[PDB]
């Protein structure tokens, strides 16, 4: 019974619905559309700012939590990778603030925002490393608590940030929500005595670095595929139409992201450890089929329900100025069902750690997204983007099942 994990997931979702509502009421579709590319860079940083080794951290930590020698080597090497990547991340941010603003916003008017992120992304990397540490020690309480306080102080940080700074303040606030988690995490890691601070001194173990490097390569492939895909599609969509039109399509994604993460909580905690243990083919197919028999009707019931109250959903989580999303709801929710269905095939590849299959999965989604947007974005606009999102994951789900039965019969 992992009630700590569900509680922190609930608090995180409630805060996201909050700040998302405030961002939509204060800045309307133009704000939700313009901030969409910036919110993308944040999630990538949470995936990569600390070299993206955190899942490799919590794994090898549990492996060697009983060997004080090997436990110090894994944490000291992980702290070394976080520190070096964070410093390199600060340098590229301060040296390329204008080109990043260009690729993200279309204008270089956000130079100061990207440069300040160089300091903010350090709180991303260290906060994530401290949380991954508490995970590998089976400290679900200290992790969930640090996540609860961090999300609360985030909402506090977002309010004062947007009230003082306006729109850019709201953008900086969004950066402070996952960054300010360093303070509760550090307090919980140290005051609880789960590990002495001497273990965090940066050392280098050649072997453990290479294993965590494969985790870094995986997050790198994750970062330069689907994230840069969505950015180009919102830039092409804001070039033919308005940034207000971007906020119309981004709003339906923001609503669907509410229930999807509580659904994915039934994945990483229960699915991923299972597929890694079992080996036989017949055993693997049985676990993929049973997860599909759960998550596919689960996401379909939630999707159909938000479609049934799409008028209420827009009025509740966003503003009435977002009334034009009602017709994009149907097309996006079908793609959501198929994306979550293809999630079980991706979590199999993650368990296999096949960088070949992961590359193929992300490249296939990026390519399908690009071609379908180029055909539908200039014609139908924001609706054409939702039509794209569905049609890729129609082909993606179909293709994923085909390569599964091929790989099941030793292709």
């Amino acid at each position: 019974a992992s009630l700590w994990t569900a509680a922190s997931t609930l608090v995180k979702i409630g805060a996201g619905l909050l700040v998302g509502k405030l961002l939509a009421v204060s800045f309307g579709p133009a704000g939700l559309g313009l901030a969409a590319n910036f919110r993308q860079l944040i999630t990538v940083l949470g995936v990569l700012a600390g070299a993206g080794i955190f899942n490799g951290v919590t794994k090898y930590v549990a492996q060697y939590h009983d060997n004080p020698q090997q436990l110090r080597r894994v944490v000291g090497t992980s702290s070394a990778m976080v520190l070096g990547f964070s410093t390199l991340m600060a340098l590229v941010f301060v040296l390329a603030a204008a080109p990043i603003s260009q690729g993200l916003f279309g204008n270089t008017d956000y130079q100061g925002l990207v440069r300040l992120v160089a300091l903010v992304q350090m709180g991303i990397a260290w906060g994530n490393l401290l949380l991954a540490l508490m995970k590998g020690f089976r400290d679900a309480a200290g992790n969930a608590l640090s996540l609860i306080v961090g999300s609360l102080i985030g909402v506090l940080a977002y309010y004062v940030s947007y009230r003082l700074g306006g729109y850019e303040g709201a953008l900086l606030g969004l950066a402070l929500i996952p960054a300010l988690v360093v303070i509760p995490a550090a307090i919980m890691l140290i005051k609880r005595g789960v590990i002495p601070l001497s273990y965090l001194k940066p050392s280098w173990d050649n072997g453990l670095a290479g294993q965590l490097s494969k985790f870094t390569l995986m997050a790198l492939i994750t970062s330069v595929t689907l994230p840069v895909a969505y950015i180009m599609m919102r830039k092409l969509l804001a070039a033919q139409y308005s940034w207000d039109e971007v906020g119309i399509w981004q709003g339906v994604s923001s609503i669907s992201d509410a229930y999807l993460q509580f659904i994915t909580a039934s994945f990483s905690v229960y699915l991923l450890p299972t597929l890694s243990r079992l080996t036989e083919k017949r055993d693997i197919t049985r676990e993929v089929v049973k997860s599909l028999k759960f998550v596919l009707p689960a996401v379909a019931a939630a999707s159909f329900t938000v479609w049934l109250l799409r008028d209420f959903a827009i009025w509740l989580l966003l503003s009435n100025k977002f009334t034009a999303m009602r017709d994009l709801f149907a097309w996006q929710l079908v793609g959501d069902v198929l994306k979550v269905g293809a999630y079980v095939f991706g979590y199999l590849v993650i368990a296999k750690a096949s960088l070949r299959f992961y590359i193929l999965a992300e490249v296939s989604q990026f390519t399908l997204l690009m071609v379908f947007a180029h055909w539908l974005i200039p014609a139908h606009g924001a609706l054409g983007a939702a039509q794209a999102y569905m049609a890729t994951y129609i082909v993606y789900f179909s293709l994923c099942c085909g390569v599964f039965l091929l790989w099941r019969r030793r292709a």
Partner: nanobody
Amino acid sequence: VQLVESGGGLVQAGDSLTLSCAASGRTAYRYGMGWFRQHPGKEREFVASIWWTGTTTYYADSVKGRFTISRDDVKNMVYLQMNSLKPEDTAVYYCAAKFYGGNSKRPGDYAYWGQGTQVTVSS
């Protein structure tokens, strides 16, 4: 959906004028709208259009800065607020409708049309 025009007439140079285009009440909020004008014997050239969601508006170069196209959904009407009329604006103004449209310059990409209101501007 049926379109009817109103608000035209004779005006002097530099004054303002508001054009109105009433639409029938059936799924009119999913229809994209646009304004066209026509010289005596000449073609129907583009003035301004609104995207069917109401977020994007398109204007011609001879139009931008002076004319404003908007939409009132509770009254099922589309407006063209004119501000600094010039003798070159003298034409017959049509409003056109298109389902899931309203981002084309060509008149052929607009299925439904109105009867048109003539606006003459002098001096």
